[PDB]
Amino acid sequence: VNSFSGYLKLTDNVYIKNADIVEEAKKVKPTVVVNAANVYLKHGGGVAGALNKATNNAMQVESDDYIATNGPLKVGGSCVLSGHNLAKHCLHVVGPNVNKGEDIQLLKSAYENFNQHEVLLAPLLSAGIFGADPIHSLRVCVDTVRTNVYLAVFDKNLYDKLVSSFL
Ligand SMILES: Cc1cc(S(=O)(=O)Nc2cnc3[nH]ccc3c2)n(C2CCCC2)n1
Asked: What's the CATH number where 48 sits?
């Protein structure tokens, strides 16, 4: 038993809710919150901008030190950093950005990072400003992630489309 509340169960291991991942993180304090990161960990907008703003820019400060030491992530890759006031840890995961021409097949590789964590609060990778079809993203999530994932979908209209079309 865990503290996530109000989720619809999609599969054995995937759950979904119409929620602001920032508010959800603030209430649950999950072990892991997933950020929709880019390779530079520049948290300017979308989920990343929202999460970073909620940390009062501490996420960005930590991220800049990470990049200065290690260089950029790979598309499809990830790193574990602090969760600041939102979670124990933040798993920064880079899904392909369609608006940069990145190969959508890398979406499966991106979701594979979730399997290194038993339970996660997460957005749909490559959705929103990353330009992928969120229905496709949900399908890849369900077919790739084997650990327990609680998906927060900000847009109510999208949440209902995701639920009603889910196979
Ligand atoms: C940008 C952005 C997108 C989302 S979202 O979770 O609601 N995803 C989503 C995906 N595609 C969409 N198309 C039209 C609307 C829409 C929304 N956020 C959340 C708002 C609260 C924190 C993060 N920020």
From this structure: 3.40.220.10
